[PDB]
Design an enzyme around this catalytic site. Sequence first.
Site, PDB file in Angstrom:
ATOM      1  N   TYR A   1     -10.498  -6.081   9.686  1.00 17.02           N
ATOM      2  CA  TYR A   1     -11.216  -5.405   8.788  1.00 17.02           C
ATOM      3  C   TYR A   1     -12.768  -5.136   8.605  1.00 17.02           C
ATOM      4  O   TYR A   1     -13.631  -4.775   8.085  1.00 17.02           O
ATOM      5  CB  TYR A   1     -10.831  -3.995   7.688  1.00 17.02           C
TER       6      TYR A   1
ATOM      7  N   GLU B   1      -3.474  -5.158  12.711  1.00 22.16           N
ATOM      8  CA  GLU B   1      -3.770  -4.320  11.842  1.00 22.16           C
ATOM      9  C   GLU B   1      -5.017  -4.167  11.998  1.00 22.16           C
ATOM     10  O   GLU B   1      -6.020  -5.707  12.416  1.00 22.16           O
ATOM     11  CB  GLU B   1      -3.596  -4.526  10.654  1.00 22.16           C
TER      12      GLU B   1
ATOM     13  N   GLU C   1       1.167  -9.835   5.667  1.00 24.13           N
ATOM     14  CA  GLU C   1      -0.179  -9.922   4.705  1.00 24.13           C
ATOM     15  C   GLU C   1      -0.004 -11.036   3.397  1.00 24.13           C
ATOM     16  O   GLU C   1       0.454 -10.431   2.316  1.00 24.13           O
ATOM     17  CB  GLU C   1      -0.850  -8.308   4.517  1.00 24.13           C
TER      18      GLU C   1
ATOM     19  N   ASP D   1       0.721  -0.865  -0.250  1.00 21.80           N
ATOM     20  CA  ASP D   1      -0.319   0.073  -0.011  1.00 21.80           C
ATOM     21  C   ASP D   1       0.938   1.602   0.121  1.00 21.80           C
ATOM     22  O   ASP D   1       0.580   2.300  -0.694  1.00 21.80           O
ATOM     23  CB  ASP D   1      -0.580  -0.462   1.223  1.00 21.80           C
TER      24      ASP D   1
HETATM   25  C1  LIG Z   1     -11.464 -10.155   2.551  1.00 25.64           C
HETATM   26  C2  LIG Z   1     -10.375  -9.503   2.476  1.00 25.64           C
HETATM   27  C3  LIG Z   1     -10.769  -8.341   1.845  1.00 25.64           C
HETATM   28  C4  LIG Z   1      -9.876  -7.662   1.780  1.00 25.64           C
HETATM   29  C5  LIG Z   1      -9.454  -6.690   2.844  1.00 25.64           C
HETATM   30  C6  LIG Z   1      -8.239  -6.220   2.530  1.00 25.64           C
HETATM   31  C7  LIG Z   1      -7.122  -5.279   3.263  1.00 25.64           C
HETATM   32  C8  LIG Z   1      -5.664  -5.417   3.057  1.00 25.64           C
HETATM   33  C9  LIG Z   1      -5.198  -4.723   4.425  1.00 25.64           C
HETATM   34  C10 LIG Z   1      -3.848  -3.776   4.157  1.00 25.64           C
HETATM   35  N1  LIG Z   1      -2.373  -4.024   4.613  1.00 25.64           N
HETATM   36  C11 LIG Z   1      -1.159  -3.591   4.356  1.00 25.64           C
HETATM   37  C12 LIG Z   1      -1.538  -2.361   5.092  1.00 25.64           C
HETATM   38  O1  LIG Z   1       0.007  -1.880   4.657  1.00 25.64           O
HETATM   39  C13 LIG Z   1      -2.693  -1.487   4.338  1.00 25.64           C
HETATM   40  O2  LIG Z   1      -3.234  -0.411   5.374  1.00 25.64           O
HETATM   41  C14 LIG Z   1      -4.246  -2.142   4.539  1.00 25.64           C
HETATM   42  C15 LIG Z   1      -5.149  -1.348   3.913  1.00 25.64           C
HETATM   43  O3  LIG Z   1      -5.998  -1.993   3.236  1.00 25.64           O
HETATM   44  O4  LIG Z   1      -5.186  -0.373   4.266  1.00 25.64           O
END
Ligand SMILES: CCCCCCCCC[C@@H]1NC[C@@H](O)[C@H](O)[C@H]1C(=O)O
Lengths: 583, 583
Positions: free
Chosen positions: B451, B487, B396, B158
């Site tokens: 999230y 996170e 991740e 990101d």
């Molecule tokens: C079921 C999954 C649906 C999509 C989920 C995506 C999660 C990705 C998490 C990401 N992980 C990396 C981090 O730098 C980022 O800030 C973060 C984000 O989204 O902004």
Amino acid sequence: RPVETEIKKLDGLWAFSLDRENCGIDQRWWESALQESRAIAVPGSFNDQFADADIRNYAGNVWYQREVFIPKGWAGQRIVLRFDAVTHYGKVWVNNQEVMEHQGGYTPFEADVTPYVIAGKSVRITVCVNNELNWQTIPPGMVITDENGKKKQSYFHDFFNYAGIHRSVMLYTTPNTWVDDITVVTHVAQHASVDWQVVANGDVSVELRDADQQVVATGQGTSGTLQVVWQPGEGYLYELCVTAKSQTECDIYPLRVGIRSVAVKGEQFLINHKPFYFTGFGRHEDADLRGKGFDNVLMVHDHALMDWIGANSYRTSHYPYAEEMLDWADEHGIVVIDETAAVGFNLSLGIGKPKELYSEEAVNGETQQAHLQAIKELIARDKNHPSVVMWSIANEPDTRPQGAREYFAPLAEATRKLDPTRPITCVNVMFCDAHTDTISDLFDVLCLNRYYGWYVQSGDLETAEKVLEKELLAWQEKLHQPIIITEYGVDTLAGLHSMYTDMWSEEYQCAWLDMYHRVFDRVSAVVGEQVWNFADFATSQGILRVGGNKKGIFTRDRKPKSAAFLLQKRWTGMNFGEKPQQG
Amino acid sequence: RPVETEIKKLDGLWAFSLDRENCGIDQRWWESALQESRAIAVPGSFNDQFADADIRNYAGNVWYQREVFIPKGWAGQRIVLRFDAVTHYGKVWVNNQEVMEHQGGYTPFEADVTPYVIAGKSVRITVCVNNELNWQTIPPGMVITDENGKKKQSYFHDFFNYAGIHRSVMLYTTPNTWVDDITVVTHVAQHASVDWQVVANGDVSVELRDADQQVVATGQGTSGTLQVVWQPGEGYLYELCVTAKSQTECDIYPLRVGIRSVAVKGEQFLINHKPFYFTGFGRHEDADLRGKGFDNVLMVHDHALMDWIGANSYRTSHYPYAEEMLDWADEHGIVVIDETAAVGFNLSLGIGKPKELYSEEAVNGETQQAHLQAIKELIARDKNHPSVVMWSIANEPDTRPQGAREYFAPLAEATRKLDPTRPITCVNVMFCDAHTDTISDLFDVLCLNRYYGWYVQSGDLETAEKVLEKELLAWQEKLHQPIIITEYGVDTLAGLHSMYTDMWSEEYQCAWLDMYHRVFDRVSAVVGEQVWNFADFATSQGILRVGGNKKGIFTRDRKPKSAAFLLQKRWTGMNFGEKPQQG
Ligand SMILES: CCCCCCCCC[C@@H]1NC[C@@H](O)[C@H](O)[C@H]1C(=O)O
Ligand SMILES: CCCCCCCCC[C@@H]1NC[C@@H](O)[C@H](O)[C@H]1C(=O)O
């Protein structure tokens, strides 16, 4: 206020025109359709409506016009034209014949147009609205001119001088026996409600119900009316049908009234013989895009915000609100401090001119008279409302120069003689503290505006707490009167945050509203608190106004700052109508 | 890391030049002064420094250059040139002779320049920095080209791909008997600390003190070192002087070390045999104006914010931080989860390309090797720090396609054999839940990014609470491991307010961080919480990033949102190092 048993003429758009050269009254613009007109919306201030910088600040004569059809069903009845509010001055013409005029502004004015109108055909209506203020207008001001004839208005209040037609225009019909004047006074001990009546060629038969047509008393006469045996929580209000009977036609008029008696005892404000505590806002008649124009959506939403945040009372700040606000106010039972447009009687509020405030060239003669007039009209319109618990003659006047007391004493006397059933007050400015104010004795409740930590002791809580405390308990020991703080607030940018909780940030509004509430809690005479402004609102251009006054708990589009949840926790966490026991 | 008993060459400005036509290495630009150069500041990313849109996204070869005076006092000592960090790739030349190169990026690289340098006269230093990413760089990416040769880089993490010289450049001097390698491991039961040493023509004499030169133990050898009888509150750390003796010169090197032993027991993380609870942030090396460049003012301020808000731990998120952060980290005793640049091993995070993530054309061979290299270097630099309690191989990664386990198993094995004194983890992505993840067994602590209510079940608390709860306790029943949520956060405009507490408003960040904390409180296996990002930070351009990632508790200029005070109330209201007893 009209009901029936009408055609609301404020529907849709009107023709709007400016008079820069001031040719209107001379060239008789009302006897013809406005040349070079543009569509305007009523109700609504004409300043913000067209995104035109030159239209917004224009000071002079504006012309409204609209043709209307008078319904056939009103053949032999008197046809009356009512303007609920035309801000500052208005002269109304009906089809080549001059009917009415009024310099009120925030109060209605009506006129009988039965001869000049033939129900069935279309007639034209031309309104001349003036937005000028001299020393004899309420509120006062002064206009200046130069070469090229450019007029520039300067006034002494804060809020922006919006003008135009601000509330609905009605065209109602009553039978030839109408009920022109009504008065009702309610009592309650540990009771009943005298009735009144004024009519023409008609007798008075008074009955009153509760929920629905369930009469629980009656009376036949213009006095007495006492019988069987309204709260700030719900607001129970009976329905008083008045009947005026004639040989041919009969008239019936319903007036909602709530049983309540307000009185001041020592340092307590008693509504129905109970000590109270005021919480809420001092709001404004201001909105995005429409100026001071009324609108039902805004009233519903703002009342939702006040209900959620825990407010139980508010003050129609600095002018008479639209009466719909007061009908809602006695419906949901919210306490209202009603106030006149008497504001700006002060030359000391200088952003950083005559020589003495109570001289002849400024505030003397017609100024005092017309102030008494604004009183007489406010009371003549809002007397019967149970939600109105207080009179407020004027707001923040300079009472330090010579002659202030000589000015304010007769107004207090006449106002008290006009409505003795309710306490009276006068909100005094900050520059006049307990040792310099000379008017707070004439009134039943003392109202206070205090900004310690903002204008003086700017940003210092540790000392503004002491000064506010000393000033407060010194007021208490001085006059032994109920003191409502009607203005206390600080400016705040909606999005500005700061770790140091310094000025203009939301943290400073939170921490500044809190200290004021502790000092409020350790003072026995404080019978209420009203954070200054509900929502940010439009003011004249100055170096102290960042696009208007930012002292609101909500923004102008009604979005909450960090203090809205603080106050929602404080006001709903305490018991309704009760003050914390010093904590 | 150097001390002495040097001339920091990163002082002031360097000459900076671009290589769009890619002529540098061919035309030997290092053997002359950069033609058409401009001043640049080190440390600091070159992208944001000049407000130039074309410079910010430039993908190719950049050239630093600076002349320096080698001090006379270093006549017969070895002169070494150290680059604390040159982001992505760097080739360093010293006055017409090529000395060094490194594809690390976030880890130092040094070279012996004693022959090529004559202490007393000025020499020029030319650095070639490359900011390109293919499938064998850590983190991975892929570059694309077209007509006109315009190179455009695309990556899978990101945060924005800042490059250049990001940390200090040193030019240190050691006697001809230096202490190139040191290792220290501490134990504690209900103890002591084995020592290590690597030198050239010198013997090892080890002593260690406490407050000031007050030795409380000693040892003579490259093993053992045990004697008399570091906390997350203060952080008591002894000073271990290592001596390397030769016939003519002697060397003394001080290494601060804190007695601590970290180990996982069932579902508890034990630092000094006590159950812990992680609170704090997953931050970034990002700042206004300087990119990922280091600066002491920022470290002091951000540590002040973390101390105030009640944070006790944080994770060097997505790359090795500047070692100054870790020296401060063991000084004030803050727990640190150290992580490599291994991020972006996933093709499922699509804003809304090879065909399989673990094929030969993407992630196979040199990719696994160079990942093991990033491990080896991170551990070879941050092994002795008592503040580092955890290893984190990758962040991740997509572990759903065929071949993920075959990839991640050997890295876990080798990393465990390299440093067995600390637990190891791998932060897995959200798309791989307990029923689909295939790697969480290889590691000691399971790290979670969740999230619910944002990406899925967007804006719905009532169901995201259930899904988060079920997923959490299902993880607990599945692997019976300590789970740290590394996170959890939602985007938030700094000034956006909303009565409905819907997405992007501060009320939604507050209410969304709260539900997650209740579900956290009713789960026994959750050994810590780390709100996603400390401060808003810069990312690549997408329709999901409103000028970067807005998931920060603070803004980019370090100003608090409404959640900062919520978390400051939560983390300081609980007892330090303890989790609430389900409430
Ligand atoms: C079921 C999954 C649906 C999509 C989920 C995506 C999660 C990705 C998490 C990401 N992980 C990396 C981090 O730098 C980022 O800030 C973060 C984000 O989204 O902004
Ligand atoms: C010692 C006095 C220092 C100056 C105090 C000035 C207080 C004036 C209060 C003003 N009263 C009128 C109100 O509409 C305005 O919003 C409010 C203000 O300031 O914005």
